[PDB]
Amino acid sequence: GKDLNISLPLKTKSIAPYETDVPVKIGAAESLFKTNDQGKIEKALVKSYHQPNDTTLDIELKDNIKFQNGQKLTAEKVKSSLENSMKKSDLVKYSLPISSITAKGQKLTIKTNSAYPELVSELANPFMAIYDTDAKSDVNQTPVGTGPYQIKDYKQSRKISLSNFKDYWQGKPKLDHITVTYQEDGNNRVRNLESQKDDLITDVPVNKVQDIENNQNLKVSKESGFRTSLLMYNHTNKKMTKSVREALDHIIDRQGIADHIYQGYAKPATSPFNDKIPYIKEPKLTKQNIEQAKMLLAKDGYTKEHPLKIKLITYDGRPELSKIAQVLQSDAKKANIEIDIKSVDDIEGYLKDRSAWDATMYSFGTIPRGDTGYFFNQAYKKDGAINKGDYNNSNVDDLINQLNHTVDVKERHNISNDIIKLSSRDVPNSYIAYNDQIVAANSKVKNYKVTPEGIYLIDYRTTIE
């Protein structure tokens, strides 16, 4: 009828909004702020805000908003949501250095101990989406949000069932039901779309785009966006020396990968951040050099007779990652490295054991809200939530800490470029490609989001005709 089936990669365990951006993606939850289609930060649930000094954020909430269970969105509900999310999530906690929150009616006041200009931007983070902390259901299974579709049932790691929330504050949502199912294999997602088992899929493998394009019942949408694929190193393993990271950095053929593996739907990467961001000063592009890799590896004493052995993790959800792993393995052998590839079903869980891997294929949304600070804090500081390999360098830390309280934007740019320059010397990770997000749908599905932040998908205007 007007039911929509969606097939996504990257199965979840908990679907608490502070554990995953999936509730925001599928239309169940909303943050106080959002980014619009051009990537700029906008008030979402907020009616008005002010910053009377650099440690004070005053917010007035819209007055016409309910949770999906009929409860009013008040300042007190927002206070308990943010406080709960900070308590339960390191990601949220390290992005929001809030010292206190007071609330009355629709107004709340958020304080920090020192200036943190990125605070408003991080309140647009989907992990900071607002839910009813007093709801009498398990937030890990059926969180209650303000979004147009309420989560009604969750089969853990498999399927989410959602229903139209008819009192949604922006307008009557246009679908009756949404069913979301997880499928890690990109080729199966496409087969599900072609056979009409699903209506909307993300992370289309680049080698299926033409097949979908030729189908008049289907359509493909692409967006260059801000997602970067990389090779992430485990810095807790002593064999992963700077010589080893540099060697592997030179075994990668970024240009070749962008052309033949991404078939032109990507650009070769240097830093974490897409070079289409105007103020970023990218480091020099590393070009494949097998001899140099062999040389560097000799420094640590590796040879054809006694090669470096590397356990490399990969996963199917981002479909090109394992294709890259395959060519890395093949090329690395020429440089006296024996790579064992292990593909896993739950990448985030697997990487938690730092004794179980030396490097991993990976992908992250490195600049979702227009500022580089989020990435540096979560990926390059010890215990940052996406720092899977525990990279940390006190000199980089110092610049990051200075960035965090820097208000002048031109100065933020300069410090950010200094962090890029200094950290690149360490090769904390090898950034491979800035790669487009590709979404495909039945041609009857209208008004889903494919925008550069790579987070949103469903909103109250998404429909079926």
Ligand SMILES: N[C@@H](Cc1c[nH]c[nH+]1)C(=O)O
């Ligand atoms: N950050 C990685 C792994 C992941 C799993 N779930 C969410 N993220 C990616 O998005 O590909």
Ligand SMILES: N[C@@H](Cc1c[nH]c[nH+]1)C(=O)O
């Ligand atoms: N999967 C999203 C969100 C995320 C947070 N941590 C890991 N992943 C990304 O990689 O951009």
Ligand code: NI
């Ligand atoms: Ni991710």
